[PDB]
Design a protein around this ligand. Structure first.
Ligand SMILES: O=S(=O)(O)OC[C@H]1O[C@@](COS(=O)(=O)O)(O[C@H]2O[C@H](COS(=O)(=O)O)[C@@H](OS(=O)(=O)O)[C@H](OS(=O)(=O)O)[C@H]2OS(=O)(=O)O)[C@@H](OS(=O)(=O)O)[C@@H]1OS(=O)(=O)O
Ligand SMILES: [Cl-]
Ligand SMILES: [Cl-]
Length: 187
């Protein structure tokens, strides 16, 4: 009999051409296909603004007729190589931020979703702790960098004969939003 029919395709971010003619012939028998378009900022799986939606035994095909088209923005606090390039939904792109700057928070790639880039492509200044801020007696900071990023550690070694609070000959402190995890002590 009938391996029966399909209903009016609810195209998200698009629509059917000749909408006034097609409605309703629906339900529509399988095999029947319709030309359709995608809205601005969106594209068909062919990479064009228009295509055809086929009524299959398992529904309408493509299942996602309209895919988002992401434009890569300018990164003021990062290195630019893709500014102006377009990417189809589901694509991941590497993001190189300047030293001291990161993505939020803190991925290394930005992915194109139906709702746009995820997360937003922008390099934000990272919170830091200063070494000039550390204070250790009977030991020294054996690293040795000036700026430490959140969650980054500062290594320290004790002087010959002195031990830390573990009590090992060396340890480390952590940089958090509130400053350093603590003071290094070598007794
Ligand atoms: O990432 S952003 O928020 O900065 O938006 C970047 C996109 O801005 C567009 C429009 O995006 S859309 O509204 O979502 O489609 O144009 C806007 O930014 C461009 C410059 O791109 S840049 O990366 O910021 O330099 C402006 O051009 S210009 O002013 O720099 O020459 C547009 O001004 S204008 O409309 O062209 O007059 C500005 O429009 S608006 O003020 O944002 O309304 C896209 O550029 S576009 O596609 O040429 O229009 C940007 O997408 S892109 O992939 O980063 O270029
Ligand atoms: Cl940025
Ligand atoms: Cl010291």
């Amino acid at each position: 009999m009938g391996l029966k029919p399909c209903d009016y395709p609810d195209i998200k971010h698009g629509g059917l051409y000749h909408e006034n003619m097609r409605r309703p012939y629906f339900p529509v028998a399988v095999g029947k296909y319709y030309s359709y378009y995608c809205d601005e900022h969106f594209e068909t799986p062919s990479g064009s603004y228009w295509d055809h939606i086929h009524c299959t035994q398992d529904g309408w095909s493509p299942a996602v007729p309209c895919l988002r088209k992401c434009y890569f923005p300018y990164l003021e606090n990062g290195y630019n190589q893709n500014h102006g390039r377009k990417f189809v939904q589901g694509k991941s792109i590497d993001v190189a931020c300047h030293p001291g700057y990161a993505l939020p928070k803190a991925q290394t790639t930005v992915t194109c979703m139906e709702n746009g880039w995820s997360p937003t492509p922008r390099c934000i200044r990272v919170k830091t702790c200063s070494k000039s801020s550390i204070d250790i007696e009977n030991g020294f900071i054996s690293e040795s960098q000036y700026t430490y990023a959140l969650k980054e550690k500062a290594k320290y070694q004790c002087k010959l004969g002195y031990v830390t609070a573990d009590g090992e000959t060396s340890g480390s402190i952590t940089c958090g939003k509130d400053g350093w995890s603590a003071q290094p002590t070598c007794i």
